[PDB]
Amino acid sequence: GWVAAALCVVIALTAAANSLLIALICTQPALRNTSNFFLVSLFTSDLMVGLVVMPPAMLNALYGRWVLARGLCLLWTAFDVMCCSASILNLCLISLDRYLLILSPLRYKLRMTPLRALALVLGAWSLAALASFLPLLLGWHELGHARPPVPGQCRLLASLPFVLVASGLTFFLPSGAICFTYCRILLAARKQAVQVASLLKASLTLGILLGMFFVTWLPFFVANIVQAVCDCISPGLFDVLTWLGYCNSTMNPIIYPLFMRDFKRALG
Amino acid sequence: ELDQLRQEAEQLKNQIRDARKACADATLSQITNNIDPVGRIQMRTRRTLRGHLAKIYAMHWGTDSRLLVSASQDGKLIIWDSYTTNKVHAIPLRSSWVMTCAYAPSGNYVACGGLDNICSIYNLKTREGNVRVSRELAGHTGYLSCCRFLDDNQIVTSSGDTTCALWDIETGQQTTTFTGHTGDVMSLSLAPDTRLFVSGACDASAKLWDVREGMCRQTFTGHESDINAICFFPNGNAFATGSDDATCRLFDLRADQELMTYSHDNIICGITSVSFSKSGRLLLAGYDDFNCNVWDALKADRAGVLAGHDNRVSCLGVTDDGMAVATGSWDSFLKIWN
Amino acid sequence: SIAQARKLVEQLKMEANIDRIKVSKAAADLMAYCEAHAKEDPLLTPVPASENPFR
Amino acid sequence: QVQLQESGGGLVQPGGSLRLSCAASGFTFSNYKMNWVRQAPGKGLEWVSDISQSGASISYTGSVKGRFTISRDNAKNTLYLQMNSLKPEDTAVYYCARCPAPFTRDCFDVTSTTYAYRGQGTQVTVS
Amino acid sequence: TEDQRNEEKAQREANKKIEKQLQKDKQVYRATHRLLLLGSGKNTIVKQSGIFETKFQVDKVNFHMFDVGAQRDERRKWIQCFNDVTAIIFVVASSTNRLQAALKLFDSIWNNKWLRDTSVILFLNKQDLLAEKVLAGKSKIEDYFPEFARYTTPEDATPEPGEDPRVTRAKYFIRDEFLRISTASGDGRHYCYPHFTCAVDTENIRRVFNDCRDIIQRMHLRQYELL
Ligand SMILES: Cc1[nH]c2ccc(Cl)cc2c1CCN(C)C
């Protein structure tokens, strides 16, 4: 119904925003710094999150069952897992880049060359790709569930070790890294602010940036363990929950360029 | 004593003022009235030259309208090729703070100078194949602001000592020294016949020199701030001058006056460069408001705007055949308009 | 101290006695030169894509 | 031509008063910021006071604060300095200097030898 | 048409061979800082031809230090070629009146149009003569500056043990005199860092190191809207 249109007006905006923003990053001459090399990768995932995965879910919202072939369900699940895993896992390298540049500013240039940046981005994408495709393709941890849906739904079902290990790593380690890095940055900003006055904005900025991520991804990862231990949660709310996990990629272009002055001047 | 000398100077100044007022009857605007307008003009940045680390103070064209040389403060002297966008040579420099560049008319030598008080000549035709220093000239006590070649053996240099010098590359000694200015002399330009040249300085005046005799002939005063760039009219009987009061002036040698002033109210920055086109109808001017303007030399009307730079405009040049214009700025770029 | 004054007055004397034409003739010469060479300026009168090496 | 003429001066009894004038011609007086300098026998150049374009921002050196005053007239292009309650230490030549550029907030070299836009000066003596 | 191909190939080879070394020089250039010394015992500070150039490293970080030599005293036009330098080290002796001239120079360099991004590391030299001479009763500070008669020492002063209150009053008055101009103009782009120094000492290079750290950290925090 109209819900399908409200969903599609989101995917169109995501595609337009991500494409335009990666083009702008790659066009202007000033924006070629190494600390802007991670960011493009993140935006890249957004497109490969938006177009590869979401439209199948739009079709699943329009029609009750899976319209396409049955063998494509595993590929769709692996695509979803890798898309989202890379999307989160790129968010920790940006915060280990902003940590080493703000809290040790005189020795960043001789200790982070573009070669290591390429190595880090490739390592992150590789970890995501393996952790998503290899066990899913080999079906290592596809057990525990009572029975697949006879009508033929493509919804992902997993066993307890998988949902407590893969999700555990891929979410709870980046969460700790991000929290520690932004905590140190906040303390440094407070110290400089107090030193300036003797001779605020960071709260709002970091609050918004971390609020988006947490309120957008935590509900799904807390519902998954409940659905793994028991079938208590009624299906249908699960889709509403996972739409937030997809809409993170919708909101990300809106927020990260909003807090950089160089990007803001380049756009204007 | 000093009072009598001051009175005599005042008497001669009054006499010269009366002699200038006598010879003027009608302005140039009263003559260039019924002539057709030049109309709107447009130019597009149909090139872009990249590869410098810091800002650009000076560039210079060549004889064949193909090669140009650019000087940067990262310590690099780059020779380019305007057509295929390739670099032919990239000379390192022993001093990072350079301020001027020059390209010899024979195509064999290049000049450099800056805050090291020394003018260096680089050779481009070496059997070994390496570009090295051929001569260093050291007789100045202030930074070098502009230098130009006459032949492969003579050079003219300008410094912040309130002096100008004529050298001899083969021997290594100064031949003639010109000393009339009271403030730093900023720019100079050679006449087509290599007989005279004009200079502008930080005392709001322009001066006319002779190369063989070594004496000054004319002094022009019509500004209110520092002179920055200067260039002859292609005929050799007039020249245009730019200052830091948002105005440009045209002066004539035959009548010892100024014919026209160029200024508009929305202009409040300074003027960093000037150049004439081939026929003398257009006057280019580079500004500190990040913009380039084209004026009509006979009506003083804003004939066009070139706006593509993101910082202060420093150096400007026009080819000898009148093909293209080249602009540099403090963003480490050079653009070739048309 | 005082050498400046005498040198300056001598230079002004040398610069004061020269001939000066009327400004109208100079303006006429400028106009004539600009009218004669109007066909050689690729900026007032544009040239086709054949002439320009900068396409 | 940028010409600056100074009027007033001479010998004045200690504890007296004096008025000094600076008339300028050759430029737009209302786009430039102006100041005074002095030069004593056996000593270099020293700063005294200044006035901005409109006449709002007035400053002083500190050794004459409250004793001397400075004023500006644009319709007549004339700048004034009133001097009160002199002393034996205030004997020197006085100069009327202009900052090098219009529409600015600072000027570097008005107390340097061989500077362009400076007048011949006047002689004031206190004894 | 073979000759045209040969010329194009030679030119492309030359361009590539040049660009490789251009990139190496880029990498070497970016990892070096630059400082402008201006002013006063300059020889004392440096120990602890137009340009004199000095290179040194502290904790494997490389600095360039530039001092103007054989030059005139008109600073109007060659002060622009230090637009992008990270720090101006300004040395002033605290003891014609030299101090007021230093104040005017600081005010001019602070309010310039092309220098509204550069920061200033201030050194107040001659502490010994600033302390010993004033105890003799020579009113060098009361007469030249008539606002000193009602100045009160701030609450944050931490003098070295054995200091006389009059000496610390004079020192902090000079520092506040310099720090009045800095706050009024700069809207967060550039700052001013005061430092008392002694003729005999060994800790000035560490002060410059820490100040450069602070300036670069502040700029990075500024571009991300954190500060
Ligand atoms: C990113 C990520 N990590 C996981 C760990 C375990 C399981 Cl079962 C699923 C996932 C996902 C994808 C969640 N939605 C998009 C399908």
- Ordered alpha helix ranges (H), chain B: 2-22
For residue E50, give the nearest of B53, B116, B184 by CB distance.
B116
Query: E touches D (3+ CB pairs < 8 Å)?
Result: yes
Q: How many other C-beta atoms are found inside a 10 Å radius of the C-beta of residue B216? A: 18
Q: With H, G, I as helix, E, B as strand and everything else as coil, classify residue D34.
A: strand
- Ordered alpha helix ranges (H), chain E: 2-30, 42-47, 98-110, 127-135, 140-144, 165-185, 204-223
Rounded CA separation D107/D120 (Å): 20
Specify whether the CB–CB gap between B262 and B248 falls below 8 A. Answer: yes
Q: Print burial letters for B203-213: b (CB count within 10 Å at least 16), e (below 16).
A: bbbbbbbebee
Instruction: Identify the domain containing residue C41 by its residue range.
Output: 1-51
Q: How far is the CA of A77 from the centre of ligand 1 (A)?
A: 9
Concatenate the DSSP letters of all residues of A201-227 into one string. Answer: HHHHHHHHHHHHHHHHHHHHHHHHHHH
Specify whether the CB–CB gap between B87 and E15 falls below 8 A. Answer: yes
Specify whether the CB–CB gap between B180 and B207 falls below 8 A. Answer: yes
The Cα of B239 is separated from the nearest Cα of chain D by a number of Å equal to: 19
Q: How many other C-beta atoms are found inside a 10 Å radius of the C-beta of residue B39? A: 9
Q: Which residues contact B143 (CB under 8 A, 6 or more apart)?
A: B99, B114, B115, B117, B159, B160, E50, E71, E78
Which residue owns the Cα nearest ligand 1 atom 11?
A81
Paired sense of beta strands E119-125 and E192-196, if any: parallel
**Which chains touch E (3+ CB pairs under 8 A)?**
A, B, D
Q: With H, G, I as helix, E, B as strand and everything else as coil, classify residue E188.
A: coil
Specify whether the CB–CB gap between E146 and D62 falls below 8 A. Answer: yes
Strand partners, B69: B60, B79
Rounded CA separation B73/B57 (Å): 8
The Cα of E74 is separated from the nearest Cα of chain A by a number of Å equal to: 32
Query: A239 labelled as ligand-binding?
Result: no
- Measured between beta carbons, the chain A residues lying within 8 angstroms of E209 are 106
Q: Which residues contact A265 (CB under 8 A, 6 or more apart)?
A: none
Rounded CA separation A18/B139 (Å): 61
Q: What is the DSSP letter of B316?
A: E
Is E74 an interface residue toward D (CB < 8 Å)?
yes
Residue C22 vs residues B20, B256, C18, C34: alpha-carbon distances, Å: 10, 10, 13, 19
**Polymer length in residues for chain C:** 55
Specify whether the CB–CB gap between D110 and D99 falls below 8 A. Answer: yes
Structure tokens at E74: 């008109």
Q: How many other C-beta atoms are found inside a 10 Å radius of the C-beta of residue A181? A: 20
Query: B touches D (3+ CB pairs < 8 Å)?
Result: yes
Q: How far is the CA of A137 from the centre of ligand 1 (A)?
A: 15
Rounded CA separation B4/D22 (Å): 22
Rounded CA separation E90/E99 (Å): 13
Rounded CA separation C16/C7 (Å): 14
Interface-testing mutation among C22, C23, C40, with chain B (most B C-beta atoms within 10 A): C23
Residue that the structure tokens 């001779």 belong to:
A199
Please report, for chain E, the start and end positions of each structural domain, with discontinuous segments joined by +. 76-222
Residue B195 vs residues B143, B208, B218, C33, E135: alpha-carbon distances, Å: 26, 11, 15, 21, 69
Q: Print burial letters for E209-219: b (CB count within 10 Å at least 16), e (below 16).
A: bebbebbbbbb
Specify whether the CB–CB gap between A78 and A132 falls below 8 A. Answer: yes
Structure tokens at A103: 């809290």
Contact E223 A261 (CB under 8 A): yes
Q: What is the atom index within ligand 1 of the atom nearest the CA of A245?
A: 15
Q: How many other C-beta atoms are found inside a 10 Å radius of the C-beta of residue D32? A: 21
Contact E29 B141 (CB under 8 A): no
Expt. technique: cryo-EM
Instruction: Identify the domain containing residue B144 by its residue range.
Output: 2-337
CB pairs under 8 A between B and C: 132
Is D113 an interface residue toward B (CB < 8 Å)?
no
Comparing alpha-carbon positions, the chain E residue that sits nearest to B57 is: E81
Comparing alpha-carbon positions, the chain D residue that sits nearest to E77 is: D108
Rounded CA separation A225/A230 (Å): 8
Query: A touches C (3+ CB pairs < 8 Å)?
Result: no
Contact E108 D112 (CB under 8 A): no
Comparing alpha-carbon positions, the chain B residue that sits nearest to E82 is: B97
Interface-testing mutation among E71, E72, E80, E96, with chain D (most D C-beta atoms within 10 A): E96
Residue B14: CATH number of its domain: 2.130.10.10
Which residue owns the Cα nearest ligand 1 atom 5?
A167
Rounded CA separation A180/A203 (Å): 15
Q: Which of D21, D124, D15 is nearest to D67 (CA)?
A: D15
Contact D101 B202 (CB under 8 A): no
Helices (H) and strands (E) in chain E, counts: 7, 6
Burial of B51 (0-12, 13-18, 19+ CB in 10 A): buried
Residue C31: CATH number of its domain: 4.10.260.10
Specify whether the CB–CB gap between E131 and E167 falls below 8 A. Answer: yes
Specify whether the CB–CB gap between E108 and D33 falls below 8 A. Answer: no
Is D49 an interface residue toward E (CB < 8 Å)?
no
Rounded CA separation E45/B87 (Å): 43
Identity (one letter) of the amino acid at B237? N
To one decimal place, what's the resolution in Å?
A: 3.1
Q: In chain B, what's the furthest Cα-to-Cα distance? A: 67
Q: Considering its fold, how many domains does chain B have in total? A: 1
Contact D106 E145 (CB under 8 A): no
Specify whether the CB–CB gap between B284 and B245 falls below 8 A. Answer: no
Q: Considering its fold, how many domains does chain D have in total? A: 1
Rounded CA separation A145/B41 (Å): 75
Rounded CA separation A188/A98 (Å): 12
Concatenate the DSSP letters of all residues of B247-299 into one string. Answer: -EEEEETTTTEEEEEE--TT--S-EEEEEE-SSSSEEEEEESSS-EEEEETTT
Instruction: Identify the domain containing residue D73 by its residue range.
Output: 3-126
Rounded CA separation D21/D80 (Å): 5
Contact E26 B53 (CB under 8 A): yes
Contact E220 A105 (CB under 8 A): yes
Contact B255 C14 (CB under 8 A): no
Kind and range of the H or E run holding B79: strand B76-79
Q: How many other C-beta atoms are found inside a 10 Å radius of the C-beta of residue D55? A: 12
Ligand 1 contacts (CB < 6 A) are: A 80-81, 84-85, 156, 158, 162-163, 166-167, 170, 242, 245
Burial of B40 (0-12, 13-18, 19+ CB in 10 A): exposed
Mutational test site, ligand 1, from A132, A156, A159, A218, max ligand atoms within 8 Å of CB: A156
Q: Considering its fold, how many domains does chain C have in total? A: 1
Q: How many other C-beta atoms are found inside a 10 Å radius of the C-beta of residue B154? A: 16
Q: What is the DSSP letter of B127?
A: S
Contact D116 B244 (CB under 8 A): no
Residue that the structure tokens 């080290």 belong to:
E89
Sign of CA dihedral B219, B222, B227, B233: negative
The Cα of C21 is separated from the nearest Cα of chain B by a number of Å equal to: 5
The Cα of C41 is separated from the nearest Cα of chain B by a number of Å equal to: 6
Concatenate the DSSP letters of all residues of A37-105 into one string. Answer: HHHHHHHHHHHHHHTTTHHHHHHHHHSSS--S-TTHHHHHHHHHHHHHHHHHHHHHHHHHHHHHHHSSG
Specify whether the CB–CB gap between B227 and B200 falls below 8 A. Answer: yes
Rounded CA separation E14/E7 (Å): 11
CATH topology of domain E76-222: Rossmann fold (3.40.50)
Rounded CA separation B308/B291 (Å): 7
Query: A252 labelled as ligand-binding?
Result: no
Rounded CA separation A22/A47 (Å): 10
Specify whether the CB–CB gap between D119 and D110 falls below 8 A. Answer: no
Paired sense of beta strands E119-125 and E87-93, if any: parallel
CB pairs under 8 A between B and D: 28
